[PDB]
Design a binder for these strands. Structure first.
Ligand SMILES: [Mg+2]
Ligand SMILES: [Mg+2]
Lengths: 308, 250, 168, 245
RNA sequence: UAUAUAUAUAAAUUGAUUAAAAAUAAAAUC
């Protein structure tokens, strides 16, 4: 397939099927597609660029042309008929994984499939192009779903330095509390909206040395006793798991958390069911896209004639 | 007139001024930094409204138009914060009334440009259990339950299958604490839904590794037709998947 | 109402000369279409000597003045086929199924987009001038189109009778 | 009430227990005398029919009291959505044919060879009533649909099944009978659709597919309400029944 | 059981002096 390159470039500003921060900003700053002061060919080309950046970036153009279905399906508000231009892709396995929130990208879902982490009706499918029929149940290994929806596991060095800084700031807080305890308690209540033993209960912590703690993670595990992370380096409660182990949702997840209509998801088991092919209905389309109907109809007119 | 237009933000932002020659910066990177805010020593961006997921069953989607491009907020008080000529984030000059004036549906709209896109509701776990009990145990058909709960039949069947898998996993305790935490997190990010032919099996004597099965068929309808179109060297090459999941040419 | 709802799209923008004795004088012609996308459309023309901006300005006002209601079938297409001859352009336009695109000449595409004609398939024979294409397009849209209700009343028949029978 | 009383000239609608008892006595004498005289039960029925018919006309004006005005009068509460007024009016101004025939058979066996007082009072109160035709039954079915009363629906399709046996129904031509039965089947389908019992509606359609011509205009409600839940199987079978043509 | 950590210094390739960018592209990490 297409070799990923400059997918998230800010100058180009093309939105991609990804949960990435750069993709989030590209979606944020775009506003809307500009089809004005343009000939029909230029409008069609812009619509192709915008829509084809999102729906099937990996698909080769001459392959997408063959996959493209000129005949669409539709089951007071207006039916958005031509948002179904890319509904054919929604039955591909990788797209189903991405829409089920079992991956942070269509490319990541592709790697999950190709690396044998995906099953469809209990048979391991290793081909991203496998098309889902209605009623199929597909599952992903829970470790990979947790990695996809979790923060990056810090290296040992990075988390060790983060712990260094946390000890520094915790010592600072307890120092300032000891100096001026009464108003510290009162002003903490001020945000939350006297017992002098309060500051007495708080206890210092010893600054660690990177040179001496390097390369000894079991030792560093015992040496940390912060109130919030007791006896584990930051983000590495069990260092043998693929994710930030005190499991934390990945950054910038709310913008891209859409619950698809055509899939029924079980996050507890990392399973999903393909209810139906996405279908447009009055005032609503089940093809999750960031572009308006004019862009989709321009892309549809492009692909009907193949750019003529 | 089409022009190669560098995708600058539609909203106004604080652009570059006179720069140290070795800065080698671009306006787009500054827009990125202003959209995010300061970077924490942990690597986080706490000042942003979108760094942290919601927890009250109300999805938090990007609203750049209703925000006028200002996407920074106090992590605790949740009151808006905006850049200042001093260079330190501070309170806005005036209230942005449009952040208060959000339509009910627009709260559920993922993308500003596409109004038709909307996020489906998550069924409550009690409702899933109720559907599973009603169908599997009481015997109410999927039609009756769909009419009862305002759901579609295929969604009901998918719910039954998923609750079966969930039951098995709970029986073996295959669910882990990380999985429970992810389930509870995702559940709180979405709005909650409110209620014949002749066949012969041949004899299998000992030592035979497989069994012939003969299905009746009629001449003129059974066979591989002669002179059939060869599509292998064409773009419409037909491809299928054997039940083992192996790609085969069908 | 006018600014917020009506959309303006330039259709023709050109320089036309009137060579006078002293020299070549060049003026700017602009032809625009204004439509609310909800069953009202109009065309406008403007001619300005000094800068095209004034031409487009007067064209926008003229289009606003000639804004007229346009018959529409299901608010998405023409009631039936329209075969129309206008000053050397032959427009053959056909209503289409829901979900069908605007598979027409580009000028007709902007006109339909402005006027809310979602569905149409057409061909332009004889001359293909954009000017004449647009003028004949609007004329054939409004003169050459009759509503099923109007046809039935003129024939003194109920809509159930006049409506076509389904065959398969 | 004013029209039924001929503007007040006839004091029929106003009643007293004195009038009730005296009229019961009078019709006891009349009917038990007429019972023996008739040659056969059929002739005794003919005499009772003539008596009740002439009695209705002398009792109240014939013109203002008929199927049409009664239909409008009972339609008032249905549109206004009051069940109690509708049922009171239906009971006070209507009688079922099979019930009348059973009462007359009972009194036939009683005289030839409180329930008896009840039957005499029934034949007396027939002056206030009109027979339940097919159209009135369909109106009461519409009332059941509007009010979502399962008991009323069950009562009415029991009474219609009984009324099919009585001679007024069999007097009509076969095509009219089949058309009215098709109308009632369609009303039952609408009731089971709105109640949400789709399977029984599809059952009613499937059972009588040959006897009745089912059009999409009849099953549009069912098809919509099935497509809302996406019962592709039931939608397919229903549409095949309709469009096999 | 705290948490918008802040301060300094040092460097900072090509183009350019800001809506002129190359460029999240590299490296690095999981
Ligand atoms: Mg060009
Ligand atoms: Mg330089």
């Amino acid at each position: 397939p297409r070799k990923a390159n400059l997918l998230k470039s800010l100058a180009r500003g093309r939105v991609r099927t990804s949960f990435n921060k750069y993709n989030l900003f590209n979606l944020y700053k775009k506003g809307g597609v500009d089809l004005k002061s343009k000939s029909l060919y230029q409008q069609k080309w812009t619509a192709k660029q915008e829509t084809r950046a999102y729906h099937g970036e990996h698909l080769t153009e001459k392959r997408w042309q063959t996959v493209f279905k000129p005949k669409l399906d539709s089951v007071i508000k207006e039916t958005p008929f031509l948002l179904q231009t890319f509904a054919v892709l929604e039955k591909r396995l990788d797209f189903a994984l991405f829409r089920a929130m079992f991956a942070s990208s269509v490319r990541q879902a592709r790697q999950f499939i190709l690396h044998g982490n995906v099953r469809v009706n209990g048979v391991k499918i290793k081909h991203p192009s496998y098309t889902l029929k209605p009623g199929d149940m597909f599952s992903v290994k829970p470790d990979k779903v947790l990695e996809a929806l979790g923060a990056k596991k810090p290296s040992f060095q990075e988390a060790l330095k983060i712990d260094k800084t946390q000890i520094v700031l915790w010592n600072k807080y307890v120092k300032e509390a000891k100096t001026e305890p009464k108003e510290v308690w009162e002003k903490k209540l001020e945000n939350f909206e006297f017992d002098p033993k309060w500051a007495k209960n708080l206890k210092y912590h010893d600054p660690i040395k990177l040179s001496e703690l390097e390369g000894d993670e079991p030792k560093a595990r015992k040496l940390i006793n912060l109130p919030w992370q007791k006896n584990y380096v930051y983000g590495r409660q069990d260092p043998k798991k693929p994710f930030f182990t005190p499991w934390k949702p990945r950054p910038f997840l709310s913008p891209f958390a859409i619950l698809p209509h055509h899939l029924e998801i079980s996050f507890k088991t990392c399973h999903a069911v393909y209810l139906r092919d996405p279908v447009a209905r009055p005032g609503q389309s089940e093809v999750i896209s960031p572009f308006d109907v004019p862009v989709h109809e321009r892309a549809y007119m492009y692909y009907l004639r193949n750019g003529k | 007139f089409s022009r190669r237009r560098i995708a600058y933000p539609f909203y106004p932002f604080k652009k570059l001024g006179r720069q140290h020659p070795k800065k080698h910066d671009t306006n787009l990177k500054t827009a990125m930094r202003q959209f995010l805010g300061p970077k924490n020593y942990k690597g986080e961006y706490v000042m942003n409204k979108y760094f942290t997921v919601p927890t009250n069953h109300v999805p938090n989607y990007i609203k750049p138009d209703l925000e006028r491009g200002q996407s920074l907020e106090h992590p605790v008080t949740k009151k808006p914060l905006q850049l200042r000529y001093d260079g330190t984030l501070g309170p806005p000059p005036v209230e942005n009334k449009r952040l208060q004036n959000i339509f009910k549906d627009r709260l559920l709209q993922p993308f500003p440009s596409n109004p038709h896109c909307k996020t489906n509701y998550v069924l409550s776990p009690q409702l899933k259990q109720s559907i599973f009990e009603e169908i599997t145990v009481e015997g109410l058909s999927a039609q009756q339950v769909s009419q009862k709960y305002g759901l579609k039949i295929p969604r009901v069947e998918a719910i039954v299958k998923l609750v079966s898998v969930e039951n098995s996993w709970n029986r073996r305790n295959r669910v882990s604490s990380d999985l429970k935490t992810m389930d509870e997190t995702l559940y709180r990010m979405f709005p909650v839904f409110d209620s014949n032919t002749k066949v012969i099996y041949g004899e299998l004597v000992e030592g035979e590794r497989s069994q012939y099965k003969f299905t009746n068929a009629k001449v003129g309808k059974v066979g591989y037709r002669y002179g059939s179109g060869n599509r292998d060297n064409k773009k419409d090459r037909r491809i299928g998947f054997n039940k083992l999941g192996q790609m085969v040419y069908i | 109402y006018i600014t917020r709802k009506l959309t303006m799209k330039p259709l023709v923008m050109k320089r036309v000369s009137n060579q006078t004795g002293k020299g070549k004088i060049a003026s700017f012609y602009a032809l625009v279409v204004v439509g609310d996308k909800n069953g009202m459309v109009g065309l406008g023309e403007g001619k300005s000597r000094e800068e095209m901006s004034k031409a487009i300005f007067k064209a926008h006002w003229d289009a606003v003045r000639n804004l007229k209601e346009i018959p529409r079938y299901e608010n998405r297409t023409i009631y039936g086929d329209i075969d129309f001859r206008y000053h050397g352009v032959k427009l053959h336009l056909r209503s289409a199924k829901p979900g069908f695109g605007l598979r027409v000449n580009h000028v007709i595409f902007e006109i339909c987009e402005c006027a809310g004609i979602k569905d149409l398939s057409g061909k332009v024979y004889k001359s293909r001038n954009d000017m004449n294409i647009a003028k004949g397009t609007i004329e054939a849209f409004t003169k050459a189109q009759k509503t099923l209700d109007e046809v039935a009343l003129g024939r003194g028949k109920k809509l159930v009778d006049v409506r076509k029978v389904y065959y398969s | 009430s004013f029209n039924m009383e001929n503007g007040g000239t006839r004091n029929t609608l106003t009643s007293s227990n004195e009038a009730a008892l005296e009229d019961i006595k009078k019709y006891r004498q009349l009917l038990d005398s007429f019972a023996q005289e008739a040659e056969d039960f059929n002739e005794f029925k003919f005499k009772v029919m003539y008596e009740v018919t002439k009695m209705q006309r002398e009792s109240i004006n014939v013109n203002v009291f008929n199927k049409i005005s009664l239909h409008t009068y009972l339609s008032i509460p249905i549109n206004l959505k009051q069940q109690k007024e509708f049922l009171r009016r239906l009971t006070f101004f209507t009688f079922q044919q099979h019930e009348f025939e059973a009462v007359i058979k009972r009194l036939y066996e009683g005289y030839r060879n409180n329930l008896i007082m009840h039957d005499i009072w029934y034949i007396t109160c027939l002056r206030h009533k009109i027979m339940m035709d097919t159209t009135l039954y369909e109106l009461v079915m519409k009332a059941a649909i509007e009010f979502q009363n399962e008991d009323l629906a069950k009562k009415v399709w029991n009474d219609r099944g009984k009324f099919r046996t009585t001679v007024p129904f069999l007097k009509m031509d076969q095509r009219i009978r089949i058309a009215k039965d098709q109308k009632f089947a369609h009303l039952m389908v609408e009731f089971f659709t709105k109640q949400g019992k789709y399977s029984d509606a599809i059952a009613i359609i499937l059972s009588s597919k040959n006897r009745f011509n089912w059009t999409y205009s009849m099953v549009r409600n069912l098809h919509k309400a099935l497509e809302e839940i996406e019962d592709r199987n039931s939608v397919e079978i229903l549409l095949d029944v309709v469009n096999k043509k």
